[PDB]
Amino acid sequence: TTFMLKYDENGTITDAVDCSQNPLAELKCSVKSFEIDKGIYQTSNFRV
Amino acid sequence: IAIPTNFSISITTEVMPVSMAKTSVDCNMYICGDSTECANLLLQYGSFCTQLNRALSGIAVEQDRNTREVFAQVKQMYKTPTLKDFGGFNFSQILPDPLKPTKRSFIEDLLFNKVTLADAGFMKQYGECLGDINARDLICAQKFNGLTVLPPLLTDDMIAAYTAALVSGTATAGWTFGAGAALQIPFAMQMAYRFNGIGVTQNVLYENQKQIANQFNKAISQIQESLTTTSTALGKLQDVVNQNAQALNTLVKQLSSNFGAISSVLNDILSRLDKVEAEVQIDRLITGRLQSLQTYVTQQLIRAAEIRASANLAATKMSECVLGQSKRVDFCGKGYHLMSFPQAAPHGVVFLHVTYVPSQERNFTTAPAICHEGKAYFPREGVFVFNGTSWFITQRNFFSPQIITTDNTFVSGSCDVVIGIINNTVYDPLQPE
Amino acid sequence: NGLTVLPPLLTDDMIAAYTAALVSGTATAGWTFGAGAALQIPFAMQMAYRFNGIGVTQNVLYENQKQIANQFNKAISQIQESLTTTSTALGKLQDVVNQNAQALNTLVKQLSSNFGAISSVLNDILSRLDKVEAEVQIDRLITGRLQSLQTYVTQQLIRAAEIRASANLAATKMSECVLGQSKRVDFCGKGYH
Amino acid sequence: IAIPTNFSISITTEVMPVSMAKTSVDCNMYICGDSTECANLLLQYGSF
Amino acid sequence: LYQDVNCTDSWRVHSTGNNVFQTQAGCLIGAEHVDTSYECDIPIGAGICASYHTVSQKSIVAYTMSLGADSSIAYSNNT
Ligand SMILES: *[C@@H]1O[C@H](CO[C@@H]2O[C@@H](C)[C@@H](O)[C@@H](O)[C@@H]2O)[C@@H](O[C@@H]2O[C@H](CO)[C@@H](O[C@@H]3O[C@H](CO)[C@@H](O)[C@H](O)[C@@H]3O)[C@H](O)[C@H]2NC(C)=O)[C@H](O)[C@H]1NC(C)=O
Ligand SMILES: *[C@@H]1O[C@H](CO[C@@H]2O[C@@H](C)[C@@H](O)[C@@H](O)[C@@H]2O)[C@@H](O[C@@H]2O[C@H](CO)[C@@H](O[C@@H]3O[C@H](CO)[C@@H](O)[C@H](O)[C@@H]3O)[C@H](O)[C@H]2NC(C)=O)[C@H](O)[C@H]1NC(C)=O
Ligand SMILES: *[C@@H]1O[C@H](CO[C@@H]2O[C@@H](C)[C@@H](O)[C@@H](O)[C@@H]2O)[C@@H](O[C@@H]2O[C@H](CO)[C@@H](O[C@@H]3O[C@H](CO)[C@@H](O)[C@H](O)[C@@H]3O)[C@H](O)[C@H]2NC(C)=O)[C@H](O)[C@H]1NC(C)=O
Ligand SMILES: *[C@@H]1O[C@H](CO)[C@@H](O[C@@H]2O[C@H](CO)[C@@H](O[C@@H]3O[C@H](CO)[C@@H](O)[C@H](O)[C@@H]3O)[C@H](O)[C@H]2NC(C)=O)[C@H](O)[C@H]1NC(C)=O
Ligand SMILES: *[C@@H]1O[C@H](CO[C@@H]2O[C@@H](C)[C@@H](O)[C@@H](O)[C@@H]2O)[C@@H](O[C@@H]2O[C@H](CO)[C@@H](O)[C@H](O)[C@H]2NC(C)=O)[C@H](O)[C@H]1NC(C)=O
Ligand SMILES: *[C@@H]1O[C@H](CO[C@@H]2O[C@@H](C)[C@@H](O)[C@@H](O)[C@@H]2O)[C@@H](O[C@@H]2O[C@H](CO)[C@@H](O)[C@H](O)[C@H]2NC(C)=O)[C@H](O)[C@H]1NC(C)=O
Ligand SMILES: *[C@@H]1O[C@H](CO)[C@@H](O)[C@H](O)[C@H]1NC(C)=O
Ligand SMILES: *[C@@H]1O[C@H](CO)[C@@H](O)[C@H](O)[C@H]1NC(C)=O
């Protein structure tokens, strides 16, 4: 799976996002940020 | 000098694109389909897809903004009048019919018939596509490759409601609702004001009201009949639709092009070749398909710039011809603009520009000024003409001779300076006493 | 190298005929031929009307007709003399011409660039290498030259958009300044048009 | 208040581009010249 | 929002947790439909907009966009 890891000032991994958990996580991984603004965003087409 | 003696009411159609299709691309779907290996290789290659989707989403928001700027120019949704006849002017064709189920006006129905929009609605279920595979539908083909078209925010019904509100406001209030609060005014008086606004006195409109109303109605019927034909009047909107469809279809067809790889079929490459050679070939294919998507997005941006210019012009036309009378030459129809009406059309608007076209010009002998006693009188508001026996002062755009009198003339200087001055007499109103 | 320039549909003589017709119409009819049927009017009276347009009474034009005509003639002669020199007044049109020529010439020159291939000379590649290796090198060259053509076409599209904006503005100027008197500030020259 | 007493008739020039050169490209000629092998390879590559 | 799914009556959706319902733009999951019309906050499409409102707690509510304040301004021919 694909993960977005966060490296802080000291270079330690302090947080991560699992891109496949839910649509919100996929959006976070696509925009490359832990914070998403209010609105509507296109995500991946429904995959099976 | 040639002075028109009669006039015609002309109604001309101006077709303007206002928006184009909002599209989005599933970069992974288009480039890799359902291959996991290709998805990992695309991740390794680098994500240029976020940039593409940022551009496309900007374009889509821009399309919604274009539609809002063109059509959403009224604060309040004025109700459609019960009666469609205003002082003899018949608005039935351009206002929604209470009885019919369309909810749009008749001309709007004709316009929506003229343009072929390909697929109706923006919903295509997976079962639908799988159940009609034999018919190689283009929409299914491009949805299976990650290309999707998003519905416009404002539906055709809402745009038609905006158009109906605009038409009703101009019919009942006129120009006053574009500046402040809509002020009611009888339609004939509004027409008299708009006649005064092109240099023709209100007397002309009031004294020929029925004839002018008949001319307006006949013009409406003639535009209706011309639209009720297989003519390509709406070629611009059809061109926009065709351009969008062709761009998507060529994007679908470009998937068949080898980009220096042994094949354009990902499954074939992955079935024949192991990880390394497959990676080489798939890198070539990824580069090629990324270039195809980038070309599509660049062309979409350029087309969207053109469409935004058209939409800005359409908004300006709605502001200056629908919400007011424009004095700019050839901006709101050809001739002396009287008014305009908007009609929704697929991906655009159609302006019915009502203009005053003078006709039946008659020749007269003219004079720059009139020498009376020892002073040069000038027409003030009008022009001097020779009717054959007596000199008269008449407005330029409509031959209405009037007795020359101090009221309609202003004196300045002596007759020596004037070059082509003509000897004549100028009556004075005080002479009756 | 396959790059051709197509002649414009309207010849320079035809465009000059259009310009002459426009000038003659404004001289004889004036503004009336932009709305309906051209109506004849003496030029002095048209000048009086256009003076009334900018808020100056007609007697100003009529009582100073000879002086105003002399000023107009002198202005015409001054523009003639200014154009007669070797100035860069028409820098915009020369810029358009130079841009087109430079785009085509850089397209020609880019054929010398290797795009990762051993050489930019197709004949050399086909003379040294057999079908497969030549195919690899020629595929590199094809990708590069297709990119060159795509860049040229994209730049042409952007330039054409700019030229279209200019041409739309020129058509608007023709309508509102030639076929009529514009009240917009600083649209048709600086001053009271 | 300042009121003008005289006036001048000014004639100013406005230079406006209207059109640019119409061009067309023989894609095969540019990319391949007169080579038949290159023409076949270009066909195989795809018609952009 | 699933643009190509009909859920009026297994669906191709992610979770279908609750508040599943159909709109002109497709199957919306996770929003409470309200019959009142407001101004558009988050445009969904096909005349549908979403917002974050206090609910009978705060939740995502989808509704039909309000085109504007309806007014009469009745026509008259002598006033
Ligand atoms: C100008 O010429 C019109 C007729 O010209 C022709 O018809 C016009 C309606 C336009 O379509 C023109 O492009 C076209 O060439 C003269 O009008 C004719 O007579 C009457 C009176 O003007 C017109 O309507 C009348 O209106 C009232 C109310 O009904 C009554 O007098 C009559 O019952 C009649 O309806 C009539 O439509 C028109 N004739 C035709 C065949 O259209 C007009 O008189 C003339 N100019 C002026 C200043 O009167
Ligand atoms: C406004 O001022 C002008 C003169 O001003 C100068 O000339 C104008 C034509 C414009 O180019 C201005 O920008 C410029 O500053 C007065 O009229 C002109 O004055 C001249 C000189 O006095 C007049 O003489 C004419 O030409 C020669 C030289 O004097 C003689 O043969 C004649 O006497 C002839 O009149 C001339 O009439 C006039 N210019 C012409 C006709 O081209 C002007 O009087 C003043 N304002 C008003 C309201 O009159
Ligand atoms: C999404 O699905 C809804 C509901 O599901 C519909 O009914 C199911 C039993 C299945 O057959 C589904 O495949 C089918 O879609 C659809 O709503 C349906 O719309 C149709 C077309 O407007 C309605 O048929 C009409 O109903 C009346 C009574 O006959 C008349 O207007 C017409 O004669 C015609 O028969 C149908 O009643 C309606 N169903 C319900 C339950 O409301 C919907 O069309 C479909 N697609 C969308 C929403 O895009
Ligand atoms: C304003 O213009 C509309 C044009 O739509 C007029 O409505 C039209 O009126 C005519 C004449 O009555 C109708 O023709 C009739 O149609 C049927 C046969 O098709 C039948 O009733 C008669 O034999 C006659 O031919 C026409 O259908 C009708 N059109 C519509 C769309 O309703 C309207 O009358 C005008 N209003 C005024 C006040 O003049
Ligand atoms: C880690 O670095 C921090 C300072 O960086 C901040 O805190 C980090 C934990 C992380 O969140 C960064 O992005 C921040 O910018 C050090 O924090 C201080 O460390 C000193 C000792 O060096 C300690 O006495 C203080 O209490 C700490 N707190 C603050 C607020 O300064 C931290 O020590 C580093 N970790 C080490 C040295 O192991
Ligand atoms: C109106 O025109 C007549 C005829 O001349 C024509 O129009 C002039 C304005 C000019 O453009 C001429 O070249 C045209 O041929 C004018 O008649 C002239 O006037 C003189 C002096 O009175 C007379 O003897 C001559 O026959 C005419 N001269 C010429 C060269 O034609 C007339 O004066 C003009 N009227 C006005 C009020 O301007
Ligand atoms: C000119 O005016 C007179 C004024 O009585 C009028 O009788 C005549 O018909 C008019 N027309 C012509 C051509 O003289
Ligand atoms: C006008 O009348 C005056 C006398 O009042 C005369 O001198 C002059 O010549 C006349 N003008 C014309 C143009 O006939």
Residue numbers in the entry:
A (entry chain C): 247 to 294
B (entry chain B): 681 to 1113
C (entry chain A): 825 to 1017
D (entry chain A): 681 to 728
E (entry chain C): 584 to 592, 605 to 651, 658 to 680
What does the paper say about this structure?
SARSr-CoV spike proteins cover the coronavirus membrane and are exposed to the solvent environment in preparation for contacting a potential host cell, undergoing a suite of conformational changes to bind the viral receptor known as angiotensin converting enzyme 2 (ACE2, in the case of SARS-related coronaviruses) and mediate membrane fusion. Each spike is composed of three identical monomers containing key domains involved in restructuring from the pre- to post-fusion state as well as in receptor binding. These include the S1 receptor binding domain (RBD) and N-terminal domain (NTD), the S2 fusion protein (FP), heptad repeats, and the transmembrane domain (TM), among others. Here we report three novel structures of SARSr-CoV spike proteins belonging to bat SARSr-CoV WIV1 (hereafter WIV1), and civet SARSr-CoV SZ3 (hereafter SZ3) and SARSr-CoV 007 (hereafter 007), at resolutions of 1.88 Å, 1.92 Å, and 2.10 Å, respectively.
Of the spikes solved in this study, the NTD, RBD and receptor binding motif (RBM) of WIV1 share the most structural similarity with SARS-CoV-2, with RMSD values 1.6 Å, 1.1 Å and 1.7 Å, respectively (S4). WIV1 has been proposed to pose a significant threat via direct transmission to humans, as both full-length and chimeric WIV1-CoV replicated efficiently both in human airway cultures as well as in vivo in BALB/c mice models. Previous work has shown WIV1 to bind ACE2 orthologs and sustain low level infection in human cells. The WIV1 structure, captured in a near-native state, shows an altered tertiary structure compared to SARS-CoV-2 by virtue of a different hydrogen bond network. Previous studies have also demonstrated that the presence of a fatty acid in the FABP is responsible for regulation of the “up” or “down” conformation paradigm of the RBD, whereby presence of the acid ensures the RBD remains in the ‘down’ conformation and loss of the acid appears to permit adoption of the ‘up’ conformation. (b) The biliverdin density in WIV1 is continuous with the density for some of the pocket residues, namely L110 and N105. Further, N709, N1134, N1074 and N1098 are glycosites on the distal end of S2 near the transmembrane domain of the SARS-CoV-2 spike and are conserved in WIV1 (except for N1074) and SZ3 (except for N1134). Coronavirus SZ3, which originated in bats and transmitted into civets sometime in the 1990s, is thought to be the result of a recombination event of bat CoV strains Rp3 and Rf1, with the recombination breakpoint at the nsp16/spike.
